[PDB]
Amino acid sequence: TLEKFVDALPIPDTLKPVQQSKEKTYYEVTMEECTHQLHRDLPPTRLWGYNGLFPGPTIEVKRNENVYVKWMNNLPSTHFLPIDHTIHEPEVKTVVHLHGGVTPDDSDGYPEAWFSKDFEQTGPYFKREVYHYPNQQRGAILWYHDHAMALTRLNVYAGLVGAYIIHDPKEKRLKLPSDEYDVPLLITDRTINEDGSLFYPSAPENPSPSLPNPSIVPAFCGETILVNGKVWPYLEVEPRKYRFRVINASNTRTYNLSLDNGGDFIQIGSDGGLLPRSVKLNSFSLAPAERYDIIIDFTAYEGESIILANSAGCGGDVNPETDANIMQFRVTKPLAQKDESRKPKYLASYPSVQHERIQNIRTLKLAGTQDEYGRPVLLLNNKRWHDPVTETPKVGTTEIWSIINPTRGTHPIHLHLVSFRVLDRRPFDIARYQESGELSYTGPAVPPPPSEKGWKDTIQAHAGEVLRIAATFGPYSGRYVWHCHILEHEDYDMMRPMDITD
Ligand SMILES: [Cu+2]
Ligand SMILES: [Cu+2]
Ligand SMILES: [Cu+2]
Ligand SMILES: [Cu+2]
Numbered sequence: 001t002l003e004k005f006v007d008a009l010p011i012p013d014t015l016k017p018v019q020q021s022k023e024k025t026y027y028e029v030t031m032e033e034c035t036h037q038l039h040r041d042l043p044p045t046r047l048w049g050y051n052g053l054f055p056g057p058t059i060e061v062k063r064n065e066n067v068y069v070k071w072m073n074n075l076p077s078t079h080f081l082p083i084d085h086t087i088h089e090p091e092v093k094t095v096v097h098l099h100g101g102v103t104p105d106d107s108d109g110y111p112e113a114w115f116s117k118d119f120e121q122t123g124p125y126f127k128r129e130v131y132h133y134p135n136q137q138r139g140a141i142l143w144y145h146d147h148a149m150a151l152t153r154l155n156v157y158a159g160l161v162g163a164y165i166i167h168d169p170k171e172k173r174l175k176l177p178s179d180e181y182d183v184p185l186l187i188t189d190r191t192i193n194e195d196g197s198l199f200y201p202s203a204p205e206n207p208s209p210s211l212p213n214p215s216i217v218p219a220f221c222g223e224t225i226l227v228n229g230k231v232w233p234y235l236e237v238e239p240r241k242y243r244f245r246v247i248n249a250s251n252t253r254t255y256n257l258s259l260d261n262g263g264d265f266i267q268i269g270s271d272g273g274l275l276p277r278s279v280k281l282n283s284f285s286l287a288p289a290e291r292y293d294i295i296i297d298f299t300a301y302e303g304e305s306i307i308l309a310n311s312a313g314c315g316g317d318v319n320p321e322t323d324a325n326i327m328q329f330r331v332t333k334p335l336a337q338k339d340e341s342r343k344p345k346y347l348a349s350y351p352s353v354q355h356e357r358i359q360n361i362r363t364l365k366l367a368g369t370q371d372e373y374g375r376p377v378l379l380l381n382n383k384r385w386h387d388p389v390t391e392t393p394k395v396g397t398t399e400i401w402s403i404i405n406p407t408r409g410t411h412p413i414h415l416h417l418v419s420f421r422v423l424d425r426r427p428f429d430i431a432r433y434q435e436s437g438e439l440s441y442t443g444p445a446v447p448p449p450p451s452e453k454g455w456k457d458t459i460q461a462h463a464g465e466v467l468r469i470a471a472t473f474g475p476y477s478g479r480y481v482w483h484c485h486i487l488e489h490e491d492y493d494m495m496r497p498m499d500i501t502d
Contacts, residue, residue, distance in 0.1 A: 001321060002192075002224060002231050005305075005328040006040045009235040010228045011183060012163065015057035026130075027059065027069045031094060031160060033076050039231040043196035048075060048158035054229045055186050055249070056144065056162025063168040067133040071096040073117045081154040082202035082214035086373070087492045088150040090116035093123065097147035098133060098164060099289060100140060100271060100419070100457055105478030107131035108416055111149035111495070123149070125479070136475070138273035138419075138455065139168030141184070141245040141291040153220070153251055153487035157200055159229075161186060161249040168273075176268065177243040177295060177341040183235075184245040187286075187326060189222030189253045189314070192231070210373050216492050218376055220251045221314035227327045234328040239302040240339035243268070246292040251487040254410065254460075256312040257326065258283040259296070261304060266343050269293025272419030272455025274348040279450045285312070287412035289458040289485040292451075295343050301331045351421045351455055356472060359397035365404045366411055366461065366484075366494075378484065378494040391482060391498045393473040403467045404439065406430045410462045411489065416480040417500065419455040420471035422448035430464050439466070458485050477502040 019026040034052035035044040050056025061067050073094045083091065093116055097109030106113070106127040114123040142164040146155035163184040176182075191199040202214040224231050248255060259265070267279040271291050284292060298306075308326040310318060318324040368378040383390065393399050400423065403413055424445040432440050445468075452459075461467045483495035 002039050002041060004232040004325055005234045007230045007233045009233040009327060010230055012053065012055050012058045012228060015059045023066060025061070025065055025067045027067070028072065029056065029069060030072045030074045032074050036229060038190070038192065038196070038226060038229065042192065045192065045196045045198060046080065047198070048155065048160050050160060050162050054159040056160070058163045058165065058184060059144070060165045060167060061133070061135050063135055063137065063139060063166055065135050067135060068130050069133065070130040073115055073119070075117060077117060079154065081158060081198070081200045083151070083154065084212060084214045084216045086212045087216050090121050092116060093148040093151060094146055094155060094160070095148050096131065096144055098142055098144045100142035101133055102135070102137040102417065102475070104132055104476050105480055107133065108480055109147040110479065111147055111152070111481065114148040135166055137166065139166050139171050140269065140271065140273040141165060141247065141293055143186070143247050143249065143291070145249070150491050153491050154200065156249075156487055157198070157220070157251055161188065163245065163247060165245065171274065174344050174347065175340065175342040177241045180336070181241065181341065182243040182245070184247065185227050185327070186247045186249045187255060188226050188249045189224065189323070190226055191223045208374055211375070212373060215373070215375065217488060218378070219315060219486070219488055221253060222250070223322060225310070225323055225326050232325055232327060234330055236330045236333045237298050238333045238335050239298050239331050240335065241295050241297050241299070241341045241343060244294050244296060246286065246294060248286045248288050248290050250288055252288065253314045254285060254287045254312050255310050255326070256283060256285050258309045258311065260307040260309045261301065263296065263301065263306065266295040266297070267292055267451055268295055268347055270451065270454045271457040275450070275454035276348050276350040277450065278343065278345050278347055281451065283311070284451065285460065287410065287458070287460050287485070288487070289412060289414055297343065298329065298331045299339070304331050305329070306331070348454070351453070356398040356470070358400055358470070359394060360399040361402065362391065362399060363402045363404065366407055377492055378489045380483070380494055380496045383496060385493050385495050385497070389497045389499050391496060392501055393498070395477040395500050395502050396472070396474050398470060398472045400468055400470050403461050403469075404428070404433070405461045405463055405465055405467070406433050408463055410460050412458050412485040413461050413482070414458040414485045415471060415482045416498065417476065418471045418473060419457045420469045422452040422456055422459060423468040423470055424448065425462065425465045425467050427465050473500045476500070
């Protein structure tokens, strides 16, 4: 395998606006095929990148900043990863979704709002070339990536991901580590061929001869871990507090992160922004699309090399020599200035402070069937993507969604537009539910841990539990989506439209 901790962690440059005034900020980002070296010992890898970069440039905005991004497809007319046409026009379709964005529906990146190179062809829900992000939302770690119908797992794996940070000036007084000491960590697993080329499976292991070729697979587990586009990198840090914006940008893989010197993380934020109170953690789980906003305090570890370690398997136990490792910190950089940053306990209002009447309670079930080829097709509430819309909350109202998971695994459930509160999780009798559809609980409800007492938008629903969340649908109305954020599930076919009605 590739030798760990030999390349420095790249820090994506912050995107500069094409125009900027007090009233408006305007950016242009072009998707390009490009080559980048992912490890000291590899030939350059052919990739798809926003502005030809992997990851894409980091975009930083202020709360309420009036932002426009023209996202353009200048990709080749053919893909380089294996497309399975049996699961679902130009071959190469793209659309950018700002995940976590409180975004008008026609700038949200609907899967059928795709566009081919230079907008020559566009999907039936396409309305505009230049996306509008008003950013009228809490400070938080967002991220952007491709969301094209039936191609999301491939377009994202190709390299189309980047970070987007909203800064709320009202949080400045907290004096959290900032600027040079505030660093995104975009984690993506990949499998890389000897010649440096990306590998993505064209079929499951030992494909029945029934199977089409290529065939979609139900899960992707990469052999190698990359952070900010480099395989198992090191980062030289100063002996002081750092803030890290940790984003799982992987297709399937869930991570369970720790520090190998037994140091703590201080979680200050979740998907939807600052937690009410900081939380000291020795480890945390991070499923696809989740974000953790954390402080690591290197003050007491000068000289040390500390591995950000992973204990979660993907298709099997972790390998100590490979996917057990994420990156390495080296506490050897001289202090540029006194550490004047803080790690405050009191961060933000509780989500509970705000009282809301429950307009509706939906029960949703994670299910599926099997296709003519024998493959599993994963479905939300046994509906196809193309079935008439059933999730139709009213704008301005709050709902509890009760998500029933009788499957064998966790699924990270994501709703666009909104962030939400986690109410509780409760175990149930799976066999009974499958035979009769009757829900019998085998234990009391478990309220969220402190890490999930703030605002979330992507949430782990574990096997044999009912998960309840509370969301206020707004402030915009229109057509959005909800889906599993395991991309191999999302594309076949674990995604549904969501109408927020006025
Ligand atoms: Cu997403
Ligand atoms: Cu999203
Ligand atoms: Cu799933
Ligand atoms: Cu989505």
